[PDB]
Write a protein that binds this ligand. Sequence first.
Ligand SMILES: CNc1ccnc(Nc2ccc3cc(C)n(-c4ccccc4Oc4ccccc4)c3c2)n1
Length: 311
Amino acid sequence: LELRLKSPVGAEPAVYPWPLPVYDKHHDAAHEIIETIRWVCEEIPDLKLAMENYVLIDYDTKSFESMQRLCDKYNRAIDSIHQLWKGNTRPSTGLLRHILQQVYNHSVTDPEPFSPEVYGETSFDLVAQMIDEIKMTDDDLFVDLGSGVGQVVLQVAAATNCKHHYGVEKADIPAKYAETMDREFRKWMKWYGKKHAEYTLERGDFLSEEWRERIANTSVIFVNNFAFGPEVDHQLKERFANMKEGGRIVSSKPFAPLNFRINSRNLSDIGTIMRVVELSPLKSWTGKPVSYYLHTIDRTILENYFSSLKN
Ligand SMILES: CNc1ccnc(Nc2ccc3cc(C)n(-c4ccccc4Oc4ccccc4)c3c2)n1
C-alpha cells in the first residue's frame, strides 16, 4: 500500500504511495528513497554503524516487499540513533542538489535549453558557482527576474544569508508550479532539519509599476535574459537605471558591451552607469563552457566623463 521514511529530526514521516509514481525518463521515486537514506547516513555517521551493510547494496526497486524491508531497516536504525541521543544548518551542496530534485519530482507530475526537468544535471553547478562568486551578505535583497518554477531562488535561499530572496514569474503554468515547489521545499527542508533563508515566490510582471521601485531597492538581481526580446531588454535597462550605486545584476547575456567607451554619441546607453565583467567557471570546472555577466551600478563612469569635459 505505502512506504514510510522516518525523519532524522523527528518531523512527520515522508509517505510514498505504492506503486511509486513514475518521474521523467532518468529519475524514479525508488532511487529517490535510496538516495534520501544514503544522504541521511552521510549527515549522521552513527546511522551507518546502526545499519547493516547489505541493506543499501542488495535491493529490488520493482518489489514492494524488498523496498519495504529497506525502509524498515533505515527506520529502525533512525529509532536506535534517537534512543542513543536520549541517553539546523544550511544543507551541503550535494544534499541541496538532491533536495531540489526531490522537490521538483514531487511538484511537477504532468508532461528548451536548461529545462527545469534537468536542473540538477545542467543548471545546479553553474548556479552554485555564481553563489560562490557573487558574495552576498545579510544586508542584501536578492531577486530572480522570471524565476519560473523557482529552482534558482530555492538554491540561493538555501545557500546565502540575504535578508530576503524573491522570485517573480509572469507565466501562469510556472507560477502555479512554484506554489507547490515552495510548499514541498519547506516540507523537505524541515524533514532533513536544514536551514534556509527567507524567500518568496510570487506571480507578477517585473515590468509593472509596482516592480519599478522593487527593482530600484534590490541590491542583487539575477536575470536569465537569454530569450528576452529587444523591448523587454530596453524596458529592463530603464528599471536598472533607478538602482543604487553598487547594485549588482547577474545575467546570461550582457546588458552593455564589455568594452564600453563613453563618448558624446552614446550618453543615453546603460553602459554609462554600470561596469560589466564576463565571469566563467572555467577561469576545477568540468561542466559546460558557459559565462555569466556581472553588472555593477557605478555612476562615476558618467561623472568622470562630465568632469573631463568641464576640466
Ligand atoms: C537557467 N534557468 C533559470 C530559471 C530561473 N531563473 C534563472 N535565473 C538565472 C539568472 C541569471 C543567470 C545567469 C546564468 C549564466 N544563469 C544560468 C544558470 C544555470 C544554467 C543556465 C543559465 O543561463 C543560461 C540560460 C540560457 C542560455 C544560456 C545561459 C542564470 C540563471 N535561470
